[PDB]
Design an enzyme around this catalytic site. Structure first.
Site, PDB file in Angstrom:
ATOM      1  N   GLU A   1       0.846  -1.189   0.000  1.00 21.44           N
ATOM      2  CA  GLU A   1       0.000   0.000   0.000  1.00 21.44           C
ATOM      3  C   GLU A   1       0.884   1.243   0.000  1.00 21.44           C
ATOM      4  O   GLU A   1       0.578   2.215  -0.692  1.00 21.44           O
ATOM      5  CB  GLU A   1      -0.925   0.034   1.223  1.00 21.44           C
ATOM      6  CG  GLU A   1      -2.094  -0.930   1.186  1.00 21.44           C
ATOM      7  CD  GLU A   1      -2.923  -0.904   2.462  1.00 21.44           C
ATOM      8  OE1 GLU A   1      -2.335  -0.912   3.568  1.00 21.44           O
ATOM      9  OE2 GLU A   1      -4.170  -0.901   2.356  1.00 21.44           O
ATOM     10  N   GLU A   2       2.027   1.198   0.719  1.00 23.00           N
ATOM     11  CA  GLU A   2       2.946   2.354   0.719  1.00 23.00           C
ATOM     12  C   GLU A   2       3.476   2.585  -0.742  1.00 23.00           C
ATOM     13  O   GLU A   2       3.622   3.729  -1.152  1.00 23.00           O
ATOM     14  CB  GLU A   2       4.106   2.095   1.707  1.00 23.00           C
ATOM     15  CG  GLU A   2       5.057   3.264   1.878  1.00 23.00           C
ATOM     16  CD  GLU A   2       6.270   3.004   2.752  1.00 23.00           C
ATOM     17  OE1 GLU A   2       6.213   2.071   3.586  1.00 23.00           O
ATOM     18  OE2 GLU A   2       7.276   3.740   2.607  1.00 23.00           O
ATOM     19  N   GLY A   3       3.700   1.499  -1.499  1.00 19.28           N
ATOM     20  CA  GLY A   3       4.140   1.562  -2.898  1.00 19.28           C
ATOM     21  C   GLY A   3       3.130   2.250  -3.797  1.00 19.28           C
ATOM     22  O   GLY A   3       3.480   3.137  -4.580  1.00 19.28           O
TER      23      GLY A   3
END
Ligand SMILES: [Cl-]
Lengths: 594, 591, 102
Positions: C7-9
């Protein structure tokens, strides 16, 4: 070396097959519009191109719509109901009040009456299909099913009982049960086959005009930004003046920024479900005038003119709209010009041109009853609601009508009786109507710069008769004075009796033409035209142009279909993609399987 | 006066006719293009045409009216075409696929003869099952055809299968006009399906027919925001087919799978519309557990084990005492004299699908690093050429020992709980487990389980016919193991009328044939599966063996399998079905 | 709330594309597919982010590419990361805790 040639042929063959299963496929469809008017019922056969697309269903290309044939004029729906009421409600059913509840015993006899007319129309539609289509076209047409749209305009509106609704249920049943021998799968539903009002007829005729002339389309002609910062878009639509046999319709786009009185409204075609949301918003002034129809105006004009002291003297009505040397019995009955030059007036109550207005102007009509002013508005138009029918239409103390051929007086009377009466007839406030009561009120409060198209057989004959005698230039563009000078000369003609029959002989030996049942009273239509143009010229906004049209030229030059309500009716169904797909294809003729 | 009421009623009757919904019968055809056969399946459905609402199918009305003759598999069409145009050694040597574009009409030529046989068989079924009134409705509406290929055509890895499907849909879209049945298809209905997709469709068939799948939920839970989270009370399915085995069952309520495996959501996959309660399932499909591949793999691993292989003799505990055959995974034919005939053709080797899958030529092996190792360690070496890859070394004869418990322990170590399973790449329709043992140890459920598949049912029915298992058997492991141990201790006796399986204590006999000689391995697979299911944290509420489901009346509505589920995934999406089946319809084919 | 490495990506991919003026309601190219349906996309740039705990790689799927059945494009509209009025964004998204600095 030539192995690559055989490889690429194989690859191309597979790409050809793959394209064939991913692309849209076209197929021909027939559509039928049965025009059930006041004096006749006629079939109209159309062809349209359907497009079938993977995961998208099937739709009609609206620009492909074309008339392939109009049929014979069969009896009107009013004729079916009157023959049924003459047999089972006895005689004097329209004189003495009848117990409608008792007529329910005779429903199969109504069906038989309706069956006779529907069989004639079905046979005629099949004859047109058979003569116009080649074998390949027939296969496509027979497989898709044939949607039938039977709409009644004038004629059947005034019974005030259960008859009309019952008739329509029987008509759809007959349409839904065609003869299987011919292979044409006709079908209908209560949304396609139904009566339509005068105002709805105007909206449909407005759609037809704008479709045929390529003004109506998904892409807008121009966009504007309102006070809120929102883009407002519209097409550059033309207005229509249609003078029919039973009423006149005026439908034109609302002028940008117009603030209408509280009591009238613009008709929004999207809100009324006449055009889908994907089309630019169309707000119109919509008006239907009962007294401006060819038949009703003729009746009312004689009723009012021949009850005026200036024109009625010792049983003789001097009519300025009729030719010098012309005379007829004093009544609003249908006129027939005979080879010896005489006029035959049909005295039958059902053939009286005042009958629809006289039945409309009745205390038994809720439209009149519900408002105090309405009854008085009728009485001031020489149709007294408290009077019995035959007396209500009688021209009192009058024996004969003699033509005086005075165009200027003809214009003055058309203006005071028909166009701007002292009291207008009651406003119609149905959804399809803007709620205007007069022509002057339309041009005073809602004039527009939109171009105007004048249509209707009589309106066109009024202009073409003048052009034919070289009284009007072929390049005539709507100048009022140019028209009045030309009509003043023509309308001064004398009726002369020759061996071949009666002739309209123009002054100064300019020439002549045969006098007949369709042209004996054409000067009144010339006067109505002068009056209409004068009211339009007095508006704050002027139409960019005014044209008289019999037809609209298609892309190839030849007209694709006729002016009138028929194309508009097809479009208001076919343009609603999802709804049309469900009714015409999903349900279809297979909905009739029993 | 009562004459008025007849008139008023007549008008209301006609008014009711033009305002209410009208029902009409439709035929639907599912062509099952399997590994060894292609068979038509003819269904009837009630359609409803509603004013301003179009036409839809009543899903509860779907009924099988006839399943036809088993014609040759699609694999035969392609294999014969490759034999002629690529050369007879195409399975064992490199082929330039580009050159084959010169022979597209010859591929069409092969598909045409098969499609003509299926079309004639479908028409024969319609004509024998429909009355004249039913025929009128059926012929008018059009007949949607859903031809789906399952196993047998997945391992070619070129342009052939996709090109074959283009040709088959073209053939379906051109039916003979003489019979009046308007067959038609499109690329959404006629297409290949994967093993895991067959599982999901079989799961949908089971729950639809048993009335467990419906818009009305069985139970709801209220979330923290006051929103109802509803579910149906669905049954799971175990299907052991000829080419693969599928296991699909609802995810245990109140559980979440870790980031290495995933629950399949039927709505997300667009198999069920949003108006049906959310259905999350554990879905697995294993080629190695199919009847044909499991037989080949069992021999390949058992006959390379020092306990069973000694001095060129492989002692097989799943085969009867008195039975023997030559040592290879070749197709066995039990001959009239009582001997076994083993077909040595590469095309008829039971290991052919696994060996074609466990190859450097298969792009699927390169999809995940450990894949090649999982193949090699299961004695299907991708580095060895095809014939060497399938060969059972230092082995001349396979002799049966009829030891049921040893057969079970070997089914455990080779098929059900192997130390290192064969590779199974995840796909949208699967959960990602590579072993049956992992499924029940980590994702067990209380949902009831239905065991299906021809061979699974034949194993139970064989024991019931010999009165070794009670008719009311309901899944007890020890009762089954007891029945199977006695049956599998039978001796093969060669007689004048042919070979027989002689039960102990003169308790009956049956003919030995090519289809039942190795039935004890299926009985062992059933015992092993029941054991793993019973040892789960959650056990199925019940277990039943079924072939079809009875309707609301008592007659069979349709058969279990992927077919009803394929129809439902199309018919349930109302707007899309209406456009494709009725708006476009057969009229889309008009030239 | 907590967010995962993957999700950070996706969020870092959105940041890059917003600031670079690649992400927006105006697509950089529209293509007519097999059916004649206009398919529109932004000209999105991929991101390689090597953080302290994990490394992310997120880039748009190559037009007309058939991924192995075992992997899948992440659709940003389906994951409710981008609204429907934004051109469709299908990405290859990967997060490796073993490629982080630590
Ligand atoms: Cl695993």
């Amino acid at each position: 070396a030539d192995t690559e040639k055989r490889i690429n042929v194989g690859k191309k063959h597979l790409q050809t097959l793959r394209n064939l299963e991913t692309r849209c496929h076209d197929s021909l469809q027939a559509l039928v519009v049965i025009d059930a008017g006041s004096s006749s019922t006629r079939t109209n056969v159309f062809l349209a191109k359907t497009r079938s697309c993977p995961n998208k269903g099937r739709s009609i290309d609206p620009d492909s719509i074309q008339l392939i044939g109009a049929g014979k004029r069969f009896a009107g729906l009013r004729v079916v109901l009157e023959e049924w009421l003459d047999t089972y409600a006895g005689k004097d059913w329209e004189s003495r009040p009848v117990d409608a509840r008792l007529l329910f015993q005779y429903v199969p006899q109504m069906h038989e009456g309706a069956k006779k007319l529907m069989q004639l129309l079905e046979e005629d539609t099949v004859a047109i299909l058979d003569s116009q289509l080649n074998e390949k076209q027939k296969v496509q047409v027979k497989a898709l099913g044939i949607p039938v749209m039977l709409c009644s305009t004038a004629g059947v509106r005034d019974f005030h009982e259960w008859y009309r609704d019952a008739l329509f249920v029987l008509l759809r049943h007959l349409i839904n049960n065609p003869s299987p021998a011919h292979g044409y799968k006709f079908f209908t539903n209560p949304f396609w086959t139904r009566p339509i009002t005068g105002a709805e007829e105007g909206l449909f005729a407005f759609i037809t005009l704008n479709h045929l002339s390529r003004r109506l389309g998904e892409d807008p002609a121009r966009c504007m930004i309102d006070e809120y910062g929102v883009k407002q878009c519209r097409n550059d639509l033309a207005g229509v003046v249609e003078v029919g046999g039973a009423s006149a319709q005026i439908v034109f786009p609302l002028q940008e920024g117009t603030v209408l009185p509280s009591s009238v409204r613009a008709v929004n075609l999207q809100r009324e479900r006449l055009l889908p949301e994907r089309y630019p918003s169309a707000d119109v002034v919509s008006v239907s005038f009962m007294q401006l129809g060819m038949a009703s105006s003729a009746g009312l004009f004689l009723k009012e003119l021949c009850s005026n002291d200036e024109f009625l003297q010792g049983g003789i009505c001097s009519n300025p709209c009729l030719f010098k040397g012309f005379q007829q019995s004093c009544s609003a009955g249908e006129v027939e010009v005979r080879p010896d030059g005489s006029a035959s007036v049909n005295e039958d109550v059902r053939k009286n041109r005042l009958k629809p207005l006289a039945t409309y102007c009745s205390v038994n009509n809720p439209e009149i009853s519900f408002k105090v002013t309405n009854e008085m508005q009728c009485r001031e138009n020489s149709i007294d609601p408290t009077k019995p029918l035959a007396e209500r239409m009688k021209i009192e103390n009058c024996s004969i009508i003699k033509g005086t051929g005075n165009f200027d007086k003809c214009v003055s009377q058309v203006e005071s009786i028909l166009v701007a009466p002292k009291l207008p007839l009651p406003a119609n406030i149905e959804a399809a109507s803007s709620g205007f009561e007069s022509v002057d009120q339309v041009f005073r409060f809602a004039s527009s710069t939109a171009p105007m198209i004048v249509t209707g057989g009589g309106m066109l004959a009024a202009i073409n008769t003048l052009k034919d005698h070289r009284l009007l230039r072929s390049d005539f563009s709507g100048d009022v004075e140019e028209l009045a000078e030309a009509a003043r000369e023509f309308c001064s003609s004398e009726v002369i009796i020759r061996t071949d029959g009666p002739v309209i002989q123009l002054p100064n030996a300019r020439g002549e033409q045969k006098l007949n049942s369709l042209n004996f009273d054409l000067c009144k239509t010339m006067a109505l035209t002068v009056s209409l143009l004068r009211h339009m010229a007095a508006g704050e906004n002027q139409p960019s142009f005014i044209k008289w049209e019999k037809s609209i030229a298609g892309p190839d030059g030849k007209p694709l279909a006729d002016l009138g309500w028929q194309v508009g009716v097809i479009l208001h169904h076919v343009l609603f993609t999802e709804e049309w797909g469900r009714n015409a294809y999903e349900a279809g003729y297979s909905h009739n399987l029993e």
